[PDB]
Design a binder for this molecule. Sequence first.
Ligand SMILES: *[C@H](N)c1nc(N2CCOCC2)nc(N(Cc2ccc(Cl)cc2)C2CCCCC2)n1
Length: 218
Amino acid sequence: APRSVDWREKGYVTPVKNQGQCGSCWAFSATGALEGQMFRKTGRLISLSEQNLVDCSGPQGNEGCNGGLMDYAFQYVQDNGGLDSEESYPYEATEESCKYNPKYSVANDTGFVDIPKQEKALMKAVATVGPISVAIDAGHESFLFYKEGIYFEPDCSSEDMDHGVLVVGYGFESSDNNKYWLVKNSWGEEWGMGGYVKMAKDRRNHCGIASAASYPTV
Ligand SMILES: *[C@H](N)c1nc(N2CCOCC2)nc(N(Cc2ccc(Cl)cc2)C2CCCCC2)n1
Protein backbone atom coordinates (compact mmCIF):
# COMPACT_ATOMS: atom_id res chain seq x y z
CA ALA A 1 0.00 0.00 0.00
CA PRO A 2 2.48 2.67 -1.07
CA ARG A 3 1.74 6.06 0.41
CA SER A 4 1.57 7.53 -3.17
CA VAL A 5 0.41 6.01 -6.49
CA ASP A 6 0.06 7.27 -10.06
CA TRP A 7 -0.75 4.77 -12.79
CA ARG A 8 -0.07 7.31 -15.52
CA GLU A 9 3.62 7.00 -14.82
CA LYS A 10 3.37 3.28 -15.48
CA GLY A 11 1.79 3.64 -18.98
CA TYR A 12 -1.69 2.45 -17.97
CA VAL A 13 -3.71 5.67 -18.76
CA THR A 14 -4.70 7.04 -22.18
CA PRO A 15 -5.09 10.78 -22.78
CA VAL A 16 -8.11 12.65 -21.31
CA LYS A 17 -11.18 12.44 -23.55
CA ASN A 18 -14.27 14.57 -24.19
CA GLN A 19 -17.70 13.02 -23.76
CA GLY A 20 -19.37 16.13 -25.15
CA GLN A 21 -23.08 16.78 -24.61
CA CYS A 22 -24.01 13.15 -23.99
CA GLY A 23 -24.75 11.00 -20.97
CA SER A 24 -21.85 8.62 -21.45
CA CYS A 25 -19.38 9.16 -18.62
CA TRP A 26 -20.07 5.54 -17.65
CA ALA A 27 -18.56 4.45 -21.03
CA PHE A 28 -15.41 6.51 -20.68
CA SER A 29 -15.02 5.22 -17.12
CA ALA A 30 -15.30 1.61 -18.20
CA THR A 31 -12.99 1.89 -21.17
CA GLY A 32 -10.55 3.61 -18.73
CA ALA A 33 -10.48 0.59 -16.52
CA LEU A 34 -10.40 -1.80 -19.42
CA GLU A 35 -7.57 0.23 -21.05
CA GLY A 36 -5.42 -0.20 -17.90
CA GLN A 37 -6.29 -3.87 -17.31
CA MET A 38 -5.51 -4.80 -20.92
CA PHE A 39 -2.28 -2.81 -20.57
CA ARG A 40 -1.39 -4.92 -17.51
CA LYS A 41 -2.07 -8.23 -19.35
CA THR A 42 -0.38 -7.22 -22.61
CA GLY A 43 1.78 -4.11 -22.19
CA ARG A 44 0.16 -2.45 -25.21
CA LEU A 45 -1.93 0.58 -24.30
CA ILE A 46 -4.80 0.84 -26.80
CA SER A 47 -7.59 3.36 -26.65
CA LEU A 48 -11.11 1.70 -26.72
CA SER A 49 -14.47 2.47 -28.26
CA GLU A 50 -16.98 4.25 -25.96
CA GLN A 51 -19.18 4.52 -29.01
CA ASN A 52 -19.23 0.73 -29.14
CA LEU A 53 -20.49 0.65 -25.52
CA VAL A 54 -23.00 3.51 -26.01
CA ASP A 55 -24.35 1.90 -29.21
CA CYS A 56 -24.44 -1.81 -28.38
CA SER A 57 -24.96 -2.45 -24.68
CA GLY A 58 -28.67 -1.88 -24.35
CA PRO A 59 -29.23 -5.58 -23.57
CA GLN A 60 -26.95 -5.20 -20.52
CA GLY A 61 -29.23 -2.44 -19.41
CA ASN A 62 -27.21 0.61 -20.38
CA GLU A 63 -29.02 3.51 -21.98
CA GLY A 64 -26.69 5.24 -24.36
CA CYS A 65 -26.49 9.00 -23.93
CA ASN A 66 -28.98 8.63 -21.07
CA GLY A 67 -26.72 6.72 -18.75
CA GLY A 68 -25.44 3.29 -17.82
CA LEU A 69 -23.14 1.60 -15.35
CA MET A 70 -19.59 0.51 -15.70
CA ASP A 71 -20.66 -2.94 -14.49
CA TYR A 72 -23.09 -3.27 -17.43
CA ALA A 73 -20.31 -2.31 -19.83
CA PHE A 74 -17.96 -4.91 -18.36
CA GLN A 75 -20.81 -7.39 -18.71
CA TYR A 76 -21.35 -6.34 -22.32
CA VAL A 77 -17.75 -7.09 -23.29
CA GLN A 78 -18.01 -10.50 -21.66
CA ASP A 79 -21.37 -11.07 -23.31
CA ASN A 80 -20.17 -9.87 -26.64
CA GLY A 81 -16.65 -11.32 -26.61
CA GLY A 82 -14.84 -8.13 -27.44
CA LEU A 83 -14.86 -4.38 -27.69
CA ASP A 84 -13.56 -2.34 -30.67
CA SER A 85 -10.71 0.16 -30.73
CA GLU A 86 -11.36 3.89 -30.60
CA GLU A 87 -9.77 4.17 -34.05
CA SER A 88 -11.93 1.55 -35.57
CA TYR A 89 -15.15 2.82 -33.97
CA PRO A 90 -14.83 6.53 -33.24
CA TYR A 91 -16.76 8.65 -30.77
CA GLU A 92 -19.78 10.31 -32.34
CA ALA A 93 -21.53 11.64 -29.20
CA THR A 94 -24.96 10.67 -30.35
CA GLU A 95 -26.33 7.17 -30.03
CA GLU A 96 -26.31 5.17 -33.23
CA SER A 97 -27.02 1.59 -34.44
CA CYS A 98 -24.65 -1.23 -33.41
CA LYS A 99 -21.70 -1.42 -35.78
CA TYR A 100 -19.59 -3.64 -33.59
CA ASN A 101 -17.12 -5.43 -35.78
CA PRO A 102 -15.51 -8.53 -34.24
CA LYS A 103 -12.43 -8.19 -36.41
CA TYR A 104 -11.39 -4.90 -34.81
CA SER A 105 -11.84 -6.18 -31.25
CA VAL A 106 -8.86 -5.46 -29.01
CA ALA A 107 -10.14 -6.16 -25.52
CA ASN A 108 -12.21 -8.89 -23.95
CA ASP A 109 -13.04 -9.55 -20.32
CA THR A 110 -13.96 -12.46 -18.10
CA GLY A 111 -16.20 -10.61 -15.67
CA PHE A 112 -15.67 -7.86 -13.18
CA VAL A 113 -14.89 -7.41 -9.46
CA ASP A 114 -17.01 -5.17 -7.24
CA ILE A 115 -14.83 -3.58 -4.52
CA PRO A 116 -16.12 -3.57 -0.89
CA LYS A 117 -17.67 -0.22 -0.06
CA GLN A 118 -14.65 1.24 1.83
CA GLU A 119 -11.78 3.64 1.11
CA LYS A 120 -9.24 1.19 2.66
CA ALA A 121 -10.42 -1.46 0.17
CA LEU A 122 -10.43 1.01 -2.65
CA MET A 123 -6.82 1.97 -1.84
CA LYS A 124 -5.76 -1.69 -1.86
CA ALA A 125 -7.37 -2.18 -5.29
CA VAL A 126 -5.90 1.06 -6.75
CA ALA A 127 -2.43 -0.03 -5.50
CA THR A 128 -2.67 -3.67 -6.41
CA VAL A 129 -4.86 -3.70 -9.53
CA GLY A 130 -4.50 -0.48 -11.52
CA PRO A 131 -7.05 2.19 -12.45
CA ILE A 132 -10.56 1.67 -10.99
CA SER A 133 -14.02 2.66 -12.31
CA VAL A 134 -15.96 4.62 -9.71
CA ALA A 135 -19.07 6.73 -9.39
CA ILE A 136 -18.99 10.14 -7.63
CA ASP A 137 -21.32 12.99 -6.70
CA ALA A 138 -20.56 15.65 -9.33
CA GLY A 139 -23.84 17.62 -9.12
CA HIS A 140 -22.35 20.88 -7.79
CA GLU A 141 -21.14 24.25 -9.15
CA SER A 142 -17.84 23.58 -7.36
CA PHE A 143 -17.14 20.42 -9.34
CA LEU A 144 -18.42 21.87 -12.62
CA PHE A 145 -15.93 24.78 -12.35
CA TYR A 146 -13.08 22.89 -10.54
CA LYS A 147 -9.59 24.14 -11.28
CA GLU A 148 -6.95 22.98 -8.80
CA GLY A 149 -6.11 21.64 -5.36
CA ILE A 150 -8.15 19.14 -3.33
CA TYR A 151 -11.88 19.04 -4.01
CA PHE A 152 -14.11 19.14 -0.96
CA GLU A 153 -17.86 19.88 -1.22
CA PRO A 154 -19.68 19.90 2.14
CA ASP A 155 -22.96 19.23 0.25
CA CYS A 156 -21.54 16.03 -1.35
CA SER A 157 -23.36 12.74 -0.77
CA SER A 158 -21.79 9.44 0.33
CA GLU A 159 -24.38 7.34 -1.57
CA ASP A 160 -26.03 9.26 -4.42
CA MET A 161 -23.66 9.28 -7.35
CA ASP A 162 -24.48 10.82 -10.72
CA HIS A 163 -21.15 10.63 -12.60
CA GLY A 164 -18.69 7.83 -13.44
CA VAL A 165 -14.94 8.52 -13.50
CA LEU A 166 -11.61 6.65 -13.24
CA VAL A 167 -9.28 6.54 -10.22
CA VAL A 168 -5.73 6.38 -11.49
CA GLY A 169 -3.87 6.91 -8.22
CA TYR A 170 -3.71 8.69 -4.85
CA GLY A 171 -1.32 10.76 -2.82
CA PHE A 172 -1.12 13.53 -0.23
CA GLU A 173 0.02 17.20 -0.11
CA SER A 174 2.39 19.22 2.13
CA SER A 175 -2.30 20.71 6.87
CA ASP A 176 -4.43 18.05 8.62
CA ASN A 177 -6.36 16.08 5.99
CA ASN A 178 -3.89 16.34 3.11
CA LYS A 179 -4.67 13.16 1.18
CA TYR A 180 -6.44 12.70 -2.19
CA TRP A 181 -7.56 10.35 -5.00
CA LEU A 182 -6.23 11.03 -8.47
CA VAL A 183 -9.29 11.02 -10.65
CA LYS A 184 -9.58 11.11 -14.45
CA ASN A 185 -12.75 12.80 -15.61
CA SER A 186 -13.96 12.91 -19.21
CA TRP A 187 -14.67 16.53 -19.95
CA GLY A 188 -11.64 17.31 -22.08
CA GLU A 189 -8.24 18.69 -21.03
CA GLU A 190 -9.51 22.24 -20.35
CA TRP A 191 -11.37 21.21 -17.22
CA GLY A 192 -9.42 21.29 -13.89
CA MET A 193 -5.89 19.89 -13.67
CA GLY A 194 -5.38 18.78 -17.25
CA GLY A 195 -8.73 16.97 -17.20
CA TYR A 196 -7.98 15.50 -13.76
CA VAL A 197 -9.25 16.12 -10.25
CA LYS A 198 -7.60 15.63 -6.85
CA MET A 199 -10.63 14.44 -4.78
CA ALA A 200 -10.51 14.38 -0.97
CA LYS A 201 -9.48 10.99 0.31
CA ASP A 202 -10.19 9.46 3.72
CA ARG A 203 -12.63 12.16 4.61
CA ARG A 204 -15.57 9.79 5.20
CA ASN A 205 -15.88 8.52 1.64
CA HIS A 206 -16.33 11.99 0.22
CA CYS A 207 -18.66 12.18 -2.82
CA GLY A 208 -19.16 8.40 -2.46
CA ILE A 209 -16.02 7.68 -4.35
CA ALA A 210 -15.56 4.35 -2.55
CA SER A 211 -19.26 3.48 -3.05
CA ALA A 212 -19.55 1.71 -6.41
CA ALA A 213 -15.98 0.89 -7.33
CA SER A 214 -15.22 -1.90 -9.75
CA TYR A 215 -12.84 -3.17 -12.48
CA PRO A 216 -12.89 -5.90 -15.10
CA THR A 217 -11.08 -9.23 -14.98
CA VAL A 218 -9.04 -9.86 -18.12
C1 LIG B 1 -22.99 10.15 -16.91
N1 LIG B 1 -22.69 11.01 -17.87
C2 LIG B 1 -24.38 9.95 -16.43
N2 LIG B 1 -25.41 10.67 -16.89
C3 LIG B 1 -26.62 10.44 -16.36
N3 LIG B 1 -27.68 11.20 -16.86
C4 LIG B 1 -27.43 12.21 -17.92
C5 LIG B 1 -28.60 12.27 -18.92
O1 LIG B 1 -29.84 12.44 -18.22
C6 LIG B 1 -30.15 11.32 -17.40
C7 LIG B 1 -29.06 11.03 -16.35
N4 LIG B 1 -26.85 9.53 -15.40
C8 LIG B 1 -25.79 8.84 -14.97
N5 LIG B 1 -25.87 7.87 -13.96
C9 LIG B 1 -27.15 7.49 -13.31
C10 LIG B 1 -27.59 6.28 -14.07
C11 LIG B 1 -28.50 6.43 -15.11
C12 LIG B 1 -28.90 5.33 -15.86
C13 LIG B 1 -28.37 4.08 -15.55
CL1 LIG B 1 -28.87 2.68 -16.50
C14 LIG B 1 -27.45 3.93 -14.50
C15 LIG B 1 -27.06 5.03 -13.77
C16 LIG B 1 -24.67 7.13 -13.54
C17 LIG B 1 -24.89 6.49 -12.17
C18 LIG B 1 -23.78 5.46 -11.94
C19 LIG B 1 -22.43 6.18 -11.93
C20 LIG B 1 -22.28 7.00 -13.21
C21 LIG B 1 -23.43 7.98 -13.39
N6 LIG B 1 -24.57 9.03 -15.47
